Design a protein around this nucleic acid. Structure first.
Ligand code: CTI
Ligand code: K
Ligand code: MG
Ligand code: OS
Ligand code: OS
Lengths: 215, 225
RNA sequence: GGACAAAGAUAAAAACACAACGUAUGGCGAAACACGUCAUACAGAUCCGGUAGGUAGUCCGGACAUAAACAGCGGGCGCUGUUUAUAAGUAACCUUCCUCCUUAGGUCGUCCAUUCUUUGUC
């Protein structure tokens, strides 16, 4: 039976100077053969801790690792701006080696309401034979948000793809784009299209809609 | 001083073979264990394979057993991963990592490569179509408006998007590409501008897809009435 | 004084040699496994009987224990049964008797048996 490493939390929000703890639980004994790594976007992971307590050469002393039974924790005594990344734990006690699902440490910020825009299909695209309608949720925090598509007040499922930006360097905010793909004919057979958004900063679920073939 | 450079990645059809290389510098691979770890786009690390020192012992993960082979060539100081019968789930960035010295680093991986991308897909190279996400005609008179470009049906990654030939960089969000069911990529780039400027100021998005030799400049303008 | 005899107490007592190749755990070697090396442990010197007077870690027989192979049953694993092994070696040497396995086979031997006491009869 392969060893499982269960890492919590998957995502954590904190501020500079915070004391942060990330845990990994092993399905079986892995003795002390556990390591912690840091990965920043677009870059290779870097070793932080080996043998589950030892600080790897050149890593700052604000990182520590502890073992309690089969539970291992990585602790940052005081967060610094360079310390916001994804962190991974790995067991190397028995092959096959297993890695934790990861924990992303992100900047904590004031709740910001999303600004919602709706873009109707372009005429060039309708000449191509497909229709895409894009909802934009702009400059909101936190990342958790829900986008729902209504066609003539009919909820659509399985036709929507979402994309989220990383946290902004200045706003410490997120942005999300939702694209709904319909055929030109299916688009031509309905009139009202609405993007309903729910967010923590929204005191009510905002809806931004347009009516087909209208200014 | 110590370095690992992966190479040999690229685009391969499903059921096809690829052979990755991990060239080492600043150390001899014979005195270390060498590991391959992959990361699918938008997902976590996955251990793939390991080769031990002085025996050649090879250990693999279930996802790759029988279809992947890890080898080492000490005279060229290079590790190798041979992939056969590749499938879509194998698309990932592949790192090779050195396991550290047991006295110094336990079993942690102390040096990694930059990675190399492996894309398993039957898609052919295609330049994007670029459509105007025109600003809302109902935009507020003195409020912020949003306008954008949709870059659609292009393979493979990446594309680059600038606005007004890079003069307009503030308030622009270029979203990560999402692979759609077609196997072609799609993304959108949007910018928020003051609504007073929509008739006075012209907004162009410049989309580049080097793999297909595609340069397009699309002007986004409010539509009639 | 002595002789023959039985019954006691006491003492003695077998040559030569006795093997970690290997396995396990741990440390180290640029070292998760393999490999090399080192450390430690592991080789039925168990129990009972017999060997014709006595003396057995090694003889002979049985029991137990441990290991391996094989057969069978049940739902790689477990249980049951049987067989074999547990040094080399009672080999080799010295040595008696017997047999046409005689250029052999079996078989007697190889060590100790001291000191003192009681009784019966001459
Ligand atoms: C009644 O008790 C007996 C009976 C016979 C023996 C004995 C002891 N040992 C040493 C031997 C013995 C020793 C040997 C040999 C032959 C031997 C033949 C017999 C015995 O040749 C090699 O060495 C013993 O003492 C317990
Ligand atoms: K439907
Ligand atoms: Mg014997
Ligand atoms: Os398993
Ligand atoms: Os419909």
């Amino acid at each position: 039976s392969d060893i499982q490493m269960t890492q919590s939390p998957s995502s954590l929000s904190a501020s500079v100077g915070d004391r942060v703890t990330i845990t990994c639980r092993a399905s079986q004994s892995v003795s002390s053969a556990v390591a912690w790594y840091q990965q920043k976007p677009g870059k290779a992971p870097k070793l932080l801790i080996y043998s589950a307590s030892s600080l790897y050469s050149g890593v700052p002393s604000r990182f520590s690792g502890s073992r309690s039974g089969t539970d291992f924790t990585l602790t940052i005594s005081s967060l610094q701006p360079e310390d916001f990344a994804t962190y991974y734990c790995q067991q190397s006690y028995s092959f096959p080696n297993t890695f934790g699902q990861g924990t992303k440490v992100e900047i904590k910020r004031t709740v910001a309401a999303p600004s919602v825009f709706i873009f109707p299909p372009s005429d060039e695209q309708l000449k191509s034979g497909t229709a895409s309608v894009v909802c934009l949720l702009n400059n909101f925090y936190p990342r958790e948000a829900k986008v729902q598509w209504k066609v003539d007040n009919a909820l659509q499922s399985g036709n929507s793809q979402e994309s989220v930006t990383e946290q902004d360097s200045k706003d410490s905010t997120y942005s999300l784009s939702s694209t709904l793909t319909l055929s030109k004919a299916d688009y031509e057979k309905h009139k009202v299209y609405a993007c309903e958004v729910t967010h923590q900063g929204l005191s009510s679920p905002v809806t931004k809609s347009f009516n087909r073939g209208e200014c | 001083e110590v370095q690992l450079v992966e190479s040999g990645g690229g685009l391969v059809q499903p059921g096809g073979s690829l052979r990755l290389s991990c060239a080492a510098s600043g150390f001899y691979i014979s005195y270390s264990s060498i590991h391959w770890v992959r990361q699918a786009p938008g997902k976590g690390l996955e251990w793939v394979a390991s080769i031990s020192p002085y025996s050649g012992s090879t250990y693999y993960a279930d996802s790759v057993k029988g279809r992947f082979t890890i080898s080492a060539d000490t005279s060229k100081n290079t590790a190798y991963l041979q992939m056969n019968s590749l499938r879509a789930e194998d698309t990932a960035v592949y790192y090779c990592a050195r396991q550290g010295y047991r006295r110094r680093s336990g079993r942690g991986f102390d040096y990694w490569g930059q990675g190399t991308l492996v894309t398993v897909s039957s898609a052919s190279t295609k330049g994007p179509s670029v459509f105007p996400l025109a600003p809302s005609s109902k935009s507020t008179s003195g409020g912020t408006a949003a306008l954008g470009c949709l870059v659609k049906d292009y393979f493979p990654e990446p594309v680059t998007v600038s606005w007004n030939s890079g003069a307009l960089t503030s308030g622009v969000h270029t979203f990560p590409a999402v692979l759609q069911s077609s196997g072609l990529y799609s993304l959108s780039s949007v910018v928020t501008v003051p609504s007073s400027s929509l008739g006075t100021q012209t907004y162009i998005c410049n989309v580049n897809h080097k793999p297909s030799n595609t340069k397009v400049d699309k002007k986004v303008e409010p539509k009639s009435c």
